[PDB]
């Protein structure tokens, strides 16, 4: 199989990309623990900034943002109790210094505040403090996954919680927050899990003049639950194309309002992840999902990091690295300084090829073999690229022993031979770069099942 690399961006290219499309979401209550108690956080984020030149954008939110109340007179960043360190708190408070800690991050920061408890004055005070403390503030969410609120939540005001109820609530909360802050272009609106029963298409229809308050429209996407866990299905190249397709309408609806779309919270599987979430294959999902989502028109994807020590989809923890970080790293490397990406394949098979442009010139090609592999002879697929200049190209390979490979259990993936230190996220090992001949403007590469290859032109 053979892909031509066009000399300028194809018609099915992505829009002009963000300086750092691969971002990170941190569970609200846990954010200070990530900054204070998890030495890998600093280095894992610095490694990605080292590739792209831009700090990964971050988002601080999740279900616990709708369990949280702002305490203007607390000198604590976050105050809560849990019976078991693996549990998320049922209630918590956060001080101004929570926003101050967010404000120490140099990359774009999105922070999520509470709408479920209907404490509008308290959320307005939190928003004003966020604007004062967070120089790199990007956006503020007013409620997380409002599609999961019910008639028993304060925000529902003793009436059924419907899509229409949410959309009207969001307009009122956008107007109150922005009116109080004399602000516009600030709110990360929707924040919906999937596209039903609430959608960006429905919300945008209702926003009217409240769109000037919106910074971006936000979707959450988790392809699987612990119950639908299937690693082959997750990482499948054509399966990813199907999986994201319902969001195309959402992206269209945001961009029609001249507002970017984001996946402001996304990861492989729900409830902190299941048995497939810590695997290399989940990293390969992440890599390909990022590329397809950006071509679809999303600006940024923010990959969720949950309870410290009880999070299967996390890129890192206190003591160990996670296989999925390799997908985030490789994605960041593929996109670094790039203006555009285009799909060279038709997304009907397991095999992907993407041309990556800078200044409307092809600079890299990303190749992906999504075939699932755990035992026996490992299959492979040859990829031929045409329209190349020169005598030679270089490549870096992402591989591991198996689709199931976990860093714990000692089957760390490698990115061009390198790994990341448990407990620090420091880069380890000698980088190996592959060479391939160019003859008649053609080069051929071989990817084993469950591999990716980044070719530099």
Ligand X SMILES: *[C@@H]1O[C@H](CO)[C@@H](O)[C@H](O)[C@H]1NC(C)=O
The closest residue (CB) to ligand X is 179
Do the beta carbons of residue 280 and residue 332 sit within 8 Å?
Answer: no
Residue 348 makes contact with ligand X by CB under 6 A: no
Nearer to ligand X, 202 or 343 (CB): 343
2-41 residues near ligand X, rule: CB under 6 A: 10, 12
Q: Total residues at the site for ligand X (CB under 6 A)?
A: 12
Residue 121 makes contact with ligand X by CB under 6 A: yes
Nearer to ligand X, 241 or 395 (CB): 241
For 295, half-sphere exposure in the C-beta direction (CA atoms, 13 angstrom radius) is: 25
Q: How far is the CB of 415 from ligand X (least distance, A)?
A: 26
Nearer to ligand X, 213 or 315 (CB): 213
Q: How far is the CB of 346 from ligand X (least distance, A)?
A: 4
For 398, half-sphere exposure in the C-beta direction (CA atoms, 13 angstrom radius) is: 34
Nearer to ligand X, 10 or 39 (CB): 10
Residue selected from 51, 60, 101, 124 as contacting ligand X according to rule CB under 6 A: 124
Residue 255 makes contact with ligand X by CB under 6 A: no
Do the beta carbons of residue 405 and residue 326 sit within 8 Å?
Answer: no
Residue selected from 84, 159, 258, 346 as contacting ligand X according to rule CB under 6 A: 346
Q: How far is the CB of 70 from ligand X (least distance, A)?
A: 12
Do the beta carbons of residue 110 and residue 59 sit within 8 Å?
Answer: yes
147-186 residues near ligand X, rule: CB under 6 A: 175-176, 179-180
Q: How far is the CB of 131 from ligand X (least distance, A)?
A: 14
Nearer to ligand X, 1 or 106 (CB): 1
Do the beta carbons of residue 425 and residue 415 sit within 8 Å?
Answer: no
Residue 120 makes contact with ligand X by CB under 6 A: yes
Nearer to ligand X, 236 or 405 (CB): 236
Q: How far is the CB of 120 from ligand X (least distance, A)?
A: 5
d(C-alpha 195, C-alpha 202), whole Å: 9
Q: How far is the CB of 383 from ligand X (least distance, A)?
A: 14
Q: How far is the CB of 369 from ligand X (least distance, A)?
A: 17
Nearer to ligand X, 346 or 359 (CB): 346
Residue 433 makes contact with ligand X by CB under 6 A: no
Q: How far is the CB of 249 from ligand X (least distance, A)?
A: 17
Chain breaks in the chain (C to N over 2.5 A) after: none
Nearer to ligand X, 145 or 288 (CB): 288
Q: How far is the CB of 177 from ligand X (least distance, A)?
A: 7
Q: How far is the CB of 113 from ligand X (least distance, A)?
A: 13
Do the beta carbons of residue 57 and residue 22 sit within 8 Å?
Answer: no
Residue 347 makes contact with ligand X by CB under 6 A: yes
Residue selected from 95, 343, 362, 413 as contacting ligand X according to rule CB under 6 A: 343
d(C-alpha 215, C-alpha 161), whole Å: 25
Q: How far is the CB of 27 from ligand X (least distance, A)?
A: 27
Nearer to ligand X, 124 or 454 (CB): 124
Choose the binding region for ligand X from 116-124, 203-211, 396-404, 421-429 (rule: CB under 6 A). Answer: 116-124
Q: CB 350: neighbour CB atoms within 10 A?
A: 18
Nearer to ligand X, 3 or 329 (CB): 3
Give every CB contact of residue 179 below 8 A, 6+ residues apart in sequence.
Answer: none
Q: How far is the CB of 4 from ligand X (least distance, A)?
A: 8
Cα-Cα-Cα-Cα torsion 245, 281, 420, 310, nearest 10 degrees, comes to 80
**Tokens standing for residue 126:** 């939190």
**Tokens standing for residue 449:** 């099942």
377-396 residues near ligand X, rule: CB under 6 A: none
Site track 73-112 with ligand X (rule: CB under 6 A), x = hit:
----------------------------------------
Nearer to ligand X, 143 or 264 (CB): 143
| Residues binding ligand X (CB under 6 A) | 10, 12, 120-121, 124, 175-176, 179-180, 343, 346-347
């Amino acid at each position: 199989l053979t892909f031509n690399v066009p000399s300028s961006p194809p018609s099915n290219s992505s829009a002009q990309l963000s300086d750092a499309p691969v971002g990170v979401s941190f569970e609200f209550f846990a954010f200070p623990g990530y900054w204070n108690d998890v030495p890998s956080t600093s280095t894992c984020l610095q490694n990605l900034k080292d590739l792209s030149g831009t700090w990964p954008p971050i988002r601080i939110g999740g279900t616990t943002q709708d369990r949280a109340t702002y305490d203007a007179s607390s000198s604590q960043q976050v105050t809560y109790t849990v019976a078991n360190a693996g549990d998320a708190p049922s209630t918590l408070t956060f001080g101004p210094s929570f926003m101050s800690l967010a404000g120490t991050y140099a990359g774009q920061v999105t922070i999520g505040f509470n709408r479920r408890l209907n404490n509008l004055a308290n959320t307005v005070a939190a928003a004003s403090k966020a604007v004062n403390e967070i120089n790199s503030l990007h956006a503020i969410e007013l409620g997380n996954e409002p599609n999961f609120f019910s008639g028993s939540d304060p925000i529902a005001q003793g009436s059924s919680w419907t899509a229409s109820a949410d959309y009207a609530s969001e307009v009122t909360w956008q107007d109150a927050v922005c009116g109080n802050l004399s602000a516009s272009n600030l709110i990360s609106a929707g924040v919906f899990f999937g596209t039903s029963p609430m959608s960006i298409a429905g919300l945008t229809a209702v926003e009217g003049q409240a769109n000037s308050y919106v910074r971006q429209y936000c979707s959450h996407n988790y392809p699987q639950s612990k119950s639908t866990a299937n690693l082959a299905n997750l990482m499948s190249h054509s399966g990813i194309a199907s999986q994201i397709k319902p969001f195309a309408k959402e992206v269209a609806a945001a961009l029609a309002k001249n507002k970017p779309h984001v996946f402001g919270e996304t990861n492989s599987a729900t409830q902190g992840g299941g048995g497939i979430s810590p695997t290399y294959g989940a990293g390969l999902w992440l890599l390909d999902y990022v590329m397809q989502a950006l071509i679809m028109g999303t600006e940024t994807l923010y990959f969720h990091h949950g309870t410290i020590g009880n999070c299967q989809y996390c890129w890192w923890g206190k003591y160990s690295m996670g296989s999925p970080y390799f997908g985030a790293y490789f994605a960041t490397m593929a996109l670094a300084g790039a203006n555009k990406i285009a799909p060279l394949d038709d997304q009907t098979t397991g095999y992907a090829a993407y041309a990556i442009y800078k200044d409307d010139k092809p600079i890299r090609v990303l190749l992906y073999n999504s075939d699932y592999y755990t035992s026996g002879s490992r299959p492979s697929q040859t990829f031929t690229l045409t329209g190349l200049s020169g005598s030679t190209v270089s490549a870096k390979r992402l591989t591991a022993a198996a689709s199931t490979s976990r860093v714990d259990a000692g089957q760390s993936p490698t990115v061009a031979g390198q790994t990341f230190e448990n407990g620090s996220c420091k880069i380890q090992g000698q980088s190996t770069v592959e060479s391939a001949t160019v003859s008649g403007g053609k080069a051929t590469f071989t990817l084993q099942a469950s591999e990716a290859l980044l070719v530099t032109l």
